[PDB]
Amino acid sequence: MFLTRSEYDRGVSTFSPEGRLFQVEYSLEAIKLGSTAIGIATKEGVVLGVEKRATSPLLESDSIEKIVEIDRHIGCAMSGLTADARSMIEHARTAAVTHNLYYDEDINVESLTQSVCDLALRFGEGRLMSRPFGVALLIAGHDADDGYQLFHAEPSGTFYRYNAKAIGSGSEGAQAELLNEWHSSLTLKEAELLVLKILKQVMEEKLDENNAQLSCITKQDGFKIYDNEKTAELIKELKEKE
Amino acid sequence: TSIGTGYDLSNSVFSPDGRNFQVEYAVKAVENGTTSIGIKCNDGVVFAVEKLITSKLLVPQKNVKIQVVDRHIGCVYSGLIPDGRHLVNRGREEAASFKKLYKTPIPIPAFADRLGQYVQAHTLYNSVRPFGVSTIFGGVDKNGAHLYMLEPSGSYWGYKGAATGKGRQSAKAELEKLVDHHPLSAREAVKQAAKIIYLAHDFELEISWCSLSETNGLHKFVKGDLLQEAIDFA
Amino acid sequence: DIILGIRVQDSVILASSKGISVLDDKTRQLSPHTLMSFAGEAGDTVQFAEYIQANIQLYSIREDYELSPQAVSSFVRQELAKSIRSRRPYQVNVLIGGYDKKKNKPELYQIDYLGTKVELPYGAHGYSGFYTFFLLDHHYRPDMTTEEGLDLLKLCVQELEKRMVIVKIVDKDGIRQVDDF
Amino acid sequence: MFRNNYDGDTVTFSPTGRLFQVEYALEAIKQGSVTVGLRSNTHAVLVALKRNADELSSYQKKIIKCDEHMGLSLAGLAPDARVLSNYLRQQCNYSSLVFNRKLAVERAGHLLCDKAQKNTQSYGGRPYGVGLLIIGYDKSGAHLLEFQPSGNVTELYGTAIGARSQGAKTYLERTLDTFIKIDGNPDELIKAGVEAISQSLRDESLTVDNLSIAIVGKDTPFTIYDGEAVAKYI
Amino acid sequence: MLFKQWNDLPEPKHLLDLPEISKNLQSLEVCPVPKVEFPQDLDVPQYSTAVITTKIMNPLFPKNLLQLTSIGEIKTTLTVVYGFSFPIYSFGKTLLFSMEENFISISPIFGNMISRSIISQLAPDIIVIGTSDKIASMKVMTENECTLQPPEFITGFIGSVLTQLIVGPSKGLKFKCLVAPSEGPNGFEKLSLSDMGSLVDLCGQWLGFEPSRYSEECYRLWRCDSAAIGAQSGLYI
Amino acid sequence: TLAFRFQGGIIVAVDCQFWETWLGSQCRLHELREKERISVAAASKILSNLVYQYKMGTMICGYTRKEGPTIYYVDSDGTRLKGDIFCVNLYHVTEDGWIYH
Amino acid sequence: YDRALSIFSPDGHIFQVEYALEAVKRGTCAVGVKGKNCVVLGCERLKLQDTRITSKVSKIDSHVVLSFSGLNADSRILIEKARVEAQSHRLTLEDPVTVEYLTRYVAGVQQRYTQSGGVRPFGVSTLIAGFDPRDDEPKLYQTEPSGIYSSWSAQTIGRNSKTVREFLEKNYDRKEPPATVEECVKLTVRSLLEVIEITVVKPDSDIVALSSEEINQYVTQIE
Amino acid sequence: YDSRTTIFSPEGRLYQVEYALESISHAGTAIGIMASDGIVLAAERKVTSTLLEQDTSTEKLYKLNDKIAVAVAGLTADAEILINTARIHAQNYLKTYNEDIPVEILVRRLSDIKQGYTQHGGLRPFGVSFIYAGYDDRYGYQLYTSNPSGNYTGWKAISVGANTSAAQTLLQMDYKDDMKVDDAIELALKTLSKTTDSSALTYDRLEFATIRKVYQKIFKPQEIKDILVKTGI
Amino acid sequence: FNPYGDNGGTILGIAGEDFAVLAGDTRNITDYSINSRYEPKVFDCGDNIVMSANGFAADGDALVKRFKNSVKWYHFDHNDKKLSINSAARNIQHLLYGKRFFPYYVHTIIAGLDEDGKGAVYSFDPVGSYEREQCRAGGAAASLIMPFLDNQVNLSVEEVIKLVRDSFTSATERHIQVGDGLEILIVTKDGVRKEFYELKRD
Amino acid sequence: VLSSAVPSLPDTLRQQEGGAVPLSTQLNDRHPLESTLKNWETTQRQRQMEQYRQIFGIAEPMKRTMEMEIVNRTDFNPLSTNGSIHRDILLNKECSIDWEDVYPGTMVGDDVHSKIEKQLGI
């Protein structure tokens, strides 16, 4: 009964007792390093909000892109190792465009997240990558089969349909409040304020139009990223309501 | 010396005494399985198994442990389940291929060699582990009955009587007496095979045999009155 | 599809003939002091010219040096021959005219569709290759100057259009466009 | 202590003959949610307890259909379940195109067995951490197969895999004599299955959301009852 | 994967990957030792019971239900330099500690002294909540009853706390200890959903909360996002 | 069919199906990766390099912030050439897009 | 966890990728400043060296420029791959490579080399500057061995980076960026003196390496 | 952090490459000096035995091409593979452009090859460093050196191998930019004599070559002795 | 070796205002010899989709076989959702277009109801090209059928079925390859219905 | 190598072949002996393995191919196109010559790093 080192965590294919795969679990620890990303699904559209996390004031915060457009009615918010994300987004963009070419129909986001997870699943048998993705992304999109929906795609290869989800740094705090505040009758306008309100608590620095950017999915407008002017107004309205 | 620390963490490595310990460890995996025996008769062979019943939920007719590699070959193994069934299917593939090409059932000595090469091939490289099953197999061909027993090391020999599993020392000791006492008819061995399993030992008794005279060279199980007679003798 | 080349004492004069109507065909600028004019099959000939431009440009960026016209001509010859190895030959004719700054002397080279390189005082391809030698050989001289060369080209072009072009000059000042044929 | 040195990968046998790296994979199923499978002579039923990542998240899919005549449930690693289930579905469809036969339930469970046992013999790859409960109905009739990641496929009248699956197994054994005789009564068979899975519960109760049920038979192609359709059986 | 790398042979397991206090591995002098600054203004007698935990068990003490509030923090420093501080919390008559255990940043030496100070200044009803990678199942323990089998044991900070309650100065204090099975390096332990259910509904017996309401609060904090749940919410079906 | 360039934009009056359909797929990817509309010169160049590799008198028109109004014709043999006037239902092209007249 | 790229540390970052960054921090200093319509790149520079066959600022194209910090050998090869892509894009396509495109490709190469345990990732961080074709908006990008590329108004990488990235942070205002070639050059020079070669790139493929910077040094030194 | 060449240590340094550089420090010193009208290459033949064929045994100095030469320090076995690659690469340029390859391009290619061996797990760094001396129209006479790490630097007078620091110091104090090829020869002899660990610098231990006027002349031992006494060594 | 045969016959598709119709003869032919008198030349692929590939039978049967497999894969990937007529059309185009330099010699037609419920009929060029058409016929006697219909159409699903009967009855009268049996598939929101009628034997 | 900018075209420049002139569709007219001769050795080797499978079983071909893959993949020398010394022994070509041995057969894409990427598929 002596204390000795255990190497059930270093390897990626090494099972630990009780069947835990740690390297996948450590991959989630990388997500917690990434900037906070919020997403709320409801009627009239889905809304996404991401902390930009300016490393230095000289960094072009206007060019930090944690939200990327995959299809004219689908949007993705990413958190974690952005270098790994670019591989996933490129695959997601190709699959959505390929589906239109093959079927002349907008790709069902439930199928799109399935395709993306098939890529993050590739660290084992579909292998193309040595280690699991260190990025967890949050897909918000609208398909005319299931309505405005939000999907969270973990690096483990499993996706969940989320009414409201927060990932990245401070996700535990954000999720706890989303449980207190989310409801079915949540309109889009208050959802945008809600997303900003959630960002207020978990963002370590001051909330401002320069370090936070919102986006939404609407049938008429599609995926659009809000301009700095609108976000400033919403932030202004938020603190007035508080 | 039975551990060989330092030279036992990798396959295809010779210890200072010339032993490959990974193969020896695979032997110990065999020794933990249900004891299985095989008796070579003048007209055929007999196989017996102490299938330890786990639960009533198992379908009795589909829960069979004495595999049939080919119509004329019977196979029974003790050790790791994944390796035993993996080897049987590969052996099943070889038997079909030989029949496909040469239009005749594969001889038992030839079948054993093909399995021996496959089992031995996993003791050459460190990327694979030796099979953890000792397989007793046999049948009947132009040259008569044959009983073979290959080890995880890939070594196989012809046997007049074979035994494996946890109940190995007792079965082998009694099996030696049977050969010494009657140096058998396919009928008699079935009763003797049942006796050895009961002596070796909740468990059920599974028996199969293949003889030229009583089954025209085909492998069939023991059922109905014959079974009960063997249990009564035991 | 006519391409002409005249090597005057201090420059090289390249000329080229022009559903879709416009108001720089069959030519590519490989280097500030090198110009390449080509004629032959449409399509198969422009990709080769584009590819050569990339390689020569790549060399210039890599070394920050102006590859000599002689080296450029050799590179084209090998690539053209290497292109034909695994396919049926294609009608292509390339004129490489450049000013060698290191030697401070103009140079003109002719490359046939089979990948043979000739250093020439003057050259031509197409319909211009049947009679125009009768004029250039009689009137061309080594010490001819630029302004004289364009009178010869203007003269030459005149015979071409009787029996029947955008003009560029390469000099120490670099490539230059001309309206006076 | 000594287990740490010999559990590095699925290629090293321990001095006692144990192959730890694949034992852990079998233990990974206990992390998954409980699923229960049982069958009568003419009908086979699957009952699964889905789980959600959070109260704002939809319950994870746990039952899949490979064709109109058979399907399966999942328990263990999600990524492995994704690979095995779709790979099996790639085999349902392949046979019809070239041969136009329904791939029999017994063949479906065994073609997958070879897939799992390779990973337990080679370095780099890892044994699958997912167990399957395959139910179908073909010419032969009802079928219920439990696939373990160690390449062990067993025909079963009823079984349960996942967290706290022992309780459901005990109930099924206590009631094997009953639900087998529930023939031609699909509604009653499901109620027995729902009762069977209920014993595995600790805190969470049955709801139309978390509970999923599947059934297949001579008059019932593979149907999945989820949502409001499950209220009656609760 | 045709072959296994010849060079890939693990370093011997007798040594742990513990943080290196000083770069001077060739130091031949008595190493400096940590100090612990327990705040003296804490009115300990006001609290009838004390709870000692590591951060991985935070979800068991909801801010939303217990009305948790701070009273201060412990300070620890080390010259070679390192400085760490750990907040002290309470609710009702209960004094609570969370150390923020870490395997990479924090060496076990810091936990040892904190165990010394905590026990040297509390020597109330001691409640010790912990985890161990060497226990098959959950264990309920006290000073006069041992449930561990010989193979099993407890290591890390909780071992540090239990050591002082059993041996060393101020030994013999009455304590009730709960350890749930877990895996991973110190500060990153993972607990199964089965353990979490067994864990809240048992500590509620001693702490005395309304079990159903207490469980309802705890599961949300356990499962929504936490270091203890990790990938287990989506890595498994 | 014909098209020409003018100060106010471009006027257009009147296997190939897929290639144009497929090309619409690639421009979508380029419009995504670079987040900016693919220029006419590029689009014509992509098409020219393809019809060459698979030896379809396709034409290309557009109006870009920097490129402005340009017309490019792509011959079935891979010949690519710019055109002020092209000749071989009226449309008008502006920076905001085409207008159906 | 330290000795492989394919292993995540328990806290959730790959140490081996991080260790490549310290190699960059050991390299020679590089600086970059974005003006209103220009970009300025400054670099940190024995007795017997042949100074006539040496420029740390290598241009990837007529309009694009690329400085670097870290292992020189790795940079010389990363530059070559970028140069080929610039011409290949100019060949397969007609327009020259966008500055954002080149840094994305260069970062991809660095990111690509991180996808195997048998390859050493480039221990070089690039500082790409230039103007988009037919555009007047200066663009400056930075790439890292990890493969992350970012757009910066002003950045410094290599030896004495934190001290120089603090001087720029307080002297450079995103709302009051320098609006003259001299102004940005003075800031770049002042940036380097806190510890000279200066390169200026201007729209329409006008790249010039400044000479006689002593005037700015003398002017800045007096102030 | 030194078992393989594909691992960065916490300090961000490659120990395997550093060890390769240390290997060259134990090799015979090779010194190259560029004069106003030519270049001089010299090398200390460390492996010495009177039974060794001092003649026709060029091991330090090799001819890559007309108007180019290299002095080798370190593992002689590794050099031969790179040298043959350089010779092939030089002729490919001539076969392609009909022009003699510039020295800068040849050095760049070789250094890139050596760099690649420090970037692959199964390839160890080349334990060799070169001194390239050559002449081309772009820059005329130029002198280079390259390390196992795969990075090269231009030089006027450089010494590589054992006791490089001592030899380099002598070059700095004595090197005048306006010297002749002759004066470079005396300096090259002078620097080695004060740097060699041997009691005296005899011809059998020494090797030479020079590029001037363009002819490259690798000196036979007969004239190496003549120049040695002429210099008074 | 010639890899391409011929089987004759004819198919016809009509896009009613609401309903859709696909018809074809049942006779299989090789150089004046009747291979068989009843081979189903028109197929139902589900999802209110009826498909028929005329011309070379071995090319036609393969195309429908692959298309049917694609439908099954579409169901698996899209939660068993119905396949729209437009989606199927482009899917078939890729199948046809996937063998350009060795193409199917089949003039195939798919009939069904578009999203809004109106009749839909798509005819595919052997190299893939398709266009939405109100009515279309293909095969040997196609030229003898379309002109007659156009007179009487350019209507319910019981009076068009009269014209198709007469149209094929007229074609069989003057054309030898026209079959000795008529298959008609009727697509409506109710579903797909198969009707068979007899024609001249010789 | 496909173009990075567009993943549907060959990279004309990096693929140094004499321009895009050697287009894909045109590499169809070939010498009658080219296809048969290019992969003649492969056909003989595979045929030999089939006979081993028929007679000696699947084990022998598995052992032969596994040894060759061990030799090939553990041998990386980007400065030599010559076959490995141990490759000849396994193939039993250690005392044989062929035109492929006598005649084993650019500034841009012949660098070592090109083979490193292809060797590892990075």
Q: Please judge whether H98 and C63 are an interchain contact, meaning their C-beta atoms are less than 8 angstroms apart.
A: no
DSSP at G119: B
CA distance, residue G11 to nearest chain E CA (Å): 8
- How many CB atoms within 10 Å of residue C140? 17
Asked if A23 has any chain F CB less than 8 Å from its own CB, the reply is no
Asked if B120 has any chain D CB less than 8 Å from its own CB, the reply is no
**3-class SS of residue E200:** helix
Q: Which residues of D85-99 are buried (b: 16+ CB within 10 A; e: fewer)?
A: beebbeebeebeeee
Asked if D32 has any chain B CB less than 8 Å from its own CB, the reply is no
E 91-130 → B contacts, CB under 8 A: none
Nearest to G84 among C50, C51, C58 (CB): C58
CA distances from I82 to D70, I47, I72, I75, I88 (A): 21, 6, 10, 7, 10
- Of residues H10, H31, H18, the one with CA closest to residue H166: H31
For chains H and D, having 3+ Cβ pairs within 8 Å is answered: no
Asked if I80 has any chain A CB less than 8 Å from its own CB, the reply is no
Q: What is the residue whose two structure tokens read 């016209």?
A: C69
Torsion angle of C-alpha atoms G190, G192, G197, G200, degrees rounded to 10: -60
CA distance, residue C96 to nearest chain F CA (Å): 22
Pinpoint the alpha helices (H) of chain B. Answer: 21-31, 81-102, 108-121, 169-181, 186-200, 212-215, 224-233
Determine the residue among D13, D119, D144 to mutate to test chain B binding: the one whose Cβ has the most chain B Cβ atoms within 10 Å. D13
Q: Which two tokens stand for residue H106?
A: 């040849």
Q: Please judge whether J20 and F53 are an interchain contact, meaning their C-beta atoms are less than 8 angstroms apart.
A: yes
Determine the residue among J50, J51, J52, J54 to mutate to test chain B binding: the one whose Cβ has the most chain B Cβ atoms within 10 Å. J54
DSSP characters over J26-65: GTT---HHHHHHHTHHHHHHHHHHHHHHHHH-THHHHHHH
Asked if E146 has any chain A CB less than 8 Å from its own CB, the reply is no
- Chain centre to alpha carbon of residue I130: 13
Asked if B107 has any chain J CB less than 8 Å from its own CB, the reply is no
CA distance, residue G169 to nearest chain A CA (Å): 6
Whole-number Å distance between alpha carbons of A57 and E155? 45
DSSP characters over chain H: --SSTT---TTS--HHHHHHHHHHTTSPPEEEEEETTEEEEEEE--S--TTS--TT---SEEEEETTEEEEEEE-HHHHHHHHHHHHHHHHHHHHHHSSPPPHHHHHHHHHHHHHHHTSBTT-----EEEEEEE--TTTSSEEEEE-TTS-EEEESEEEESTTHHHHHHHHHHH--TT--HHHHHHHHHHHHHHH-SSSS--GGGEEEEEEE--EEEEPPHHHHHHHHHHHT-
- How many CB atoms within 10 Å of residue I90? 22
Q: Which two tokens stand for residue D227?
A: 């949502």
Whole-number Å distance between alpha carbons of H9 and G15? 10
Whole-number Å distance between alpha carbons of I175 and I199? 12
Residue I115: Cβ-neighbour burial (10 angstroms; 0-12, 13-18, 19+): exposed
Torsion over CA: E149, E154, E160, E161 (sign): negative
Q: What is the resolution of this structure in A?
A: 3.0
Q: Please judge whether A110 and I86 are an interchain contact, meaning their C-beta atoms are less than 8 angstroms apart.
A: no
What fold is seen in the domain I10-198? Glutamine Phosphoribosylpyrophosphate, subunit 1, domain 1 (3.60.20)
- Chain centre to alpha carbon of residue D216: 15
DSSP at E5: -
CA distances from D21 to A16, A26, B29, B127, D84 (A): 8, 20, 15, 15, 19
Q: Which two tokens stand for residue A71?
A: 């299809």
Asked if B151 has any chain D CB less than 8 Å from its own CB, the reply is no
Q: Please judge whether H112 and J116 are an interchain contact, meaning their C-beta atoms are less than 8 angstroms apart.
A: no
**3-class SS of residue I168:** helix
G44 torsion bin: left (phi>0), alpha (psi -120 to 50), beta (else): beta
- Chain centre to alpha carbon of residue D208: 20
- Chain centre to alpha carbon of residue J73: 13
CA distances from H3 to E6, H118, I2, I95 (A): 12, 13, 64, 54
Whole-number Å distance between alpha carbons of A68 and D75? 34
Whole-number Å distance between alpha carbons of B92 and A61? 66
What's the CATH code, domain G15-222? 3.60.20.10
Question: What does the domain layout of chain D look like in residue ranges?
Answer: 1-234
Q: What is the residue whose two structure tokens read 């292109």?
A: C83
List CB contacts of J51: < 8 A, sequence separation 6 or more: none
Q: Which two tokens stand for residue D233?
A: 């059986």
Residues on chain G touching C58 (C-beta within 8 angstroms):
83-84, 87
Determine the residue among C38, C55, C61 to mutate to test chain J binding: the one whose Cβ has the most chain J Cβ atoms within 10 Å. C55
Phi/psi of residue C119, nearest 5 degrees: -85, 125
Question: What does the domain layout of chain C look like in residue ranges?
Answer: 1-181
Q: Which two tokens stand for residue E142?
A: 């006290």
- Of residues H30, H45, H93, H96, the one with CA closest to residue H66: H93
E15 torsion bin: left (phi>0), alpha (psi -120 to 50), beta (else): beta
Sheet holding D152-155, edge to edge: D63-65, D70-76, D130-137, D142-148, D152-155
Taking a C-beta distance cutoff of 8 angstroms, is the pair A217, A45 a contact? yes
Taking a C-beta distance cutoff of 8 angstroms, is the pair H152, H145 a contact? yes
Q: What is the residue whose two structure tokens read 């011959």?
A: F75
Nearest to F52 among J6, J8, J20 (CB): J20
Q: What angle do CA G64, G68, G70 make, to 5 degrees?
A: 165
Q: Please judge whether J76 and H113 are an interchain contact, meaning their C-beta atoms are less than 8 angstroms apart.
A: no
List CB contacts of D126: < 8 A, sequence separation 6 or more: A13, A14, A15, A124, D10, D21, D25, D119
Q: Please judge whether F15 and I93 are an interchain contact, meaning their C-beta atoms are less than 8 angstroms apart.
A: no
User: Which residues of B are catalytic, by number?
Assistant: 34
Torsion over CA: I141, I146, I147, I148 (sign): positive
| Superfamily for the E35-224 domain | POC1 chaperone (3.40.50.12120)
| Superfamily for the B21-233 domain | Aminohydrolase, N-terminal nucleophile (Ntn) domain (3.60.20.10)
Q: What angle do CA D88, I45, A142 make, to 5 degrees?
A: 70
What chain J residue is nearest to G101 in terms of C-alpha separation? J5
Taking a C-beta distance cutoff of 8 angstroms, is the pair E16, E108 a contact? no
For chains C and H, having 3+ Cβ pairs within 8 Å is answered: yes
Q: What is the residue whose two structure tokens read 């995103």?
A: G174
What ranges make up the beta strands (E) of chain G? 30-34, 39-43, 64-70, 124-131, 138-143, 149-151, 154-157, 197-202, 206-209
Residues on chain D touching E234 (C-beta within 8 angstroms):
53, 60, 78
Taking a C-beta distance cutoff of 8 angstroms, is the pair E4, B127 a contact? yes
DSSP at A20: -
Asked if J56 has any chain H CB less than 8 Å from its own CB, the reply is no
Q: Please judge whether A57 and G169 are an interchain contact, meaning their C-beta atoms are less than 8 angstroms apart.
A: yes
Asked if G88 has any chain J CB less than 8 Å from its own CB, the reply is yes
Whole-number Å distance between alpha carbons of D218 and D142? 9
Whole-number Å distance between alpha carbons of B133 and C174? 83
Residues on chain F touching C21 (C-beta within 8 angstroms):
83-85, 87
Amino acid at site C92: V
Question: What does the domain layout of chain I look like in residue ranges?
Answer: 10-198
Whole-number Å distance between alpha carbons of C164 and H77? 69
Whole-number Å distance between alpha carbons of B15 and E237? 44
Q: Which two tokens stand for residue G179?
A: 């609006």
**3-class SS of residue G163:** helix
Q: Please judge whether J79 and H119 are an interchain contact, meaning their C-beta atoms are less than 8 angstroms apart.
A: no
Taking a C-beta distance cutoff of 8 angstroms, is the pair C9, C141 a contact? no
Q: Which chains touch A (3 or more CB pairs under 8 A)?
A: D, E, F, G, I
Taking a C-beta distance cutoff of 8 angstroms, is the pair B154, B120 a contact? yes
Taking a C-beta distance cutoff of 8 angstroms, is the pair F28, F38 a contact? no
- Give the technique used to solve this structure: cryo-EM
Q: Please judge whether G80 and C62 are an interchain contact, meaning their C-beta atoms are less than 8 angstroms apart.
A: yes
CA distance, residue J117 to nearest chain E CA (Å): 18
Amino acid at site H177: D
D 60-119 → I contacts, CB under 8 A: 89, 93, 97
Determine the residue among D6, D30, D54 to mutate to test chain E binding: the one whose Cβ has the most chain E Cβ atoms within 10 Å. D54
Asked if H10 has any chain G CB less than 8 Å from its own CB, the reply is yes
Whole-number Å distance between alpha carbons of E158 and I121? 75
Q: Please judge whether H97 and C63 are an interchain contact, meaning their C-beta atoms are less than 8 angstroms apart.
A: no
DSSP characters over E121-162: HH--EEEEEEEETT-SS-EEEETTB----TT----HHHHHHH
Q: CATH class for domain H15-231?
A: alpha beta
Q: What is the residue whose two structure tokens read 């040496």?
A: G54
